[PDB]
């Protein structure tokens, strides 16, 4: 693992300590603003469920993707920064995000 944001955060958040996760997205917004998405635009999820919601606005996100040579225990990631709408699946009470369906 290098020193880029992805290699470090994937490790710190317990994603690559015992495996190399192929892809992962980190959202750079307040927790409350992401939870607010559960009452925004209702859309179908990839699996066909209707408990997904798309954010009205784009959000700051960092995409982390394993390079072609990455191999446990030396996971390596390519970091890509972008601003896009997020789609999360929500459940429970309070109605909060439990899955990241995608980013547009």
């Amino acid at each position: 693992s290098s020193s880029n944001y992805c290699n470090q955060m994937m490790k710190s958040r317990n994603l690559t300590k015992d495996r190399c996760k192929p892809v992962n997205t980190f959202v750079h917004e307040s927790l409350a603003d992401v939870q607010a998405v559960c009452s925004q635009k209702n859309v179908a999820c990839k699996n066909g469920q209707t408990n997904c919601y798309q954010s009205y606005s784009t959000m700051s996100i960092t995409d982390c993707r394993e390079t072609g040579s990455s191999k446990y225990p030396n996971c390596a990631y390519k970091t890509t920064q972008a601003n896009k709408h997020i789609i999360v699946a929500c459940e429970g009470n309070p109605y909060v995000p439990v899955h990241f369906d995608a980013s547009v």
């Binding site: 980190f26 917004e29 429970g92 909060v96 995000p97």
Partner: peptide
Amino acid sequence: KETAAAKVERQHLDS
């Protein structure tokens, strides 16, 4: 242990 909501925060949020 860790709820689905908490897992989502740990894996995807960086405020």
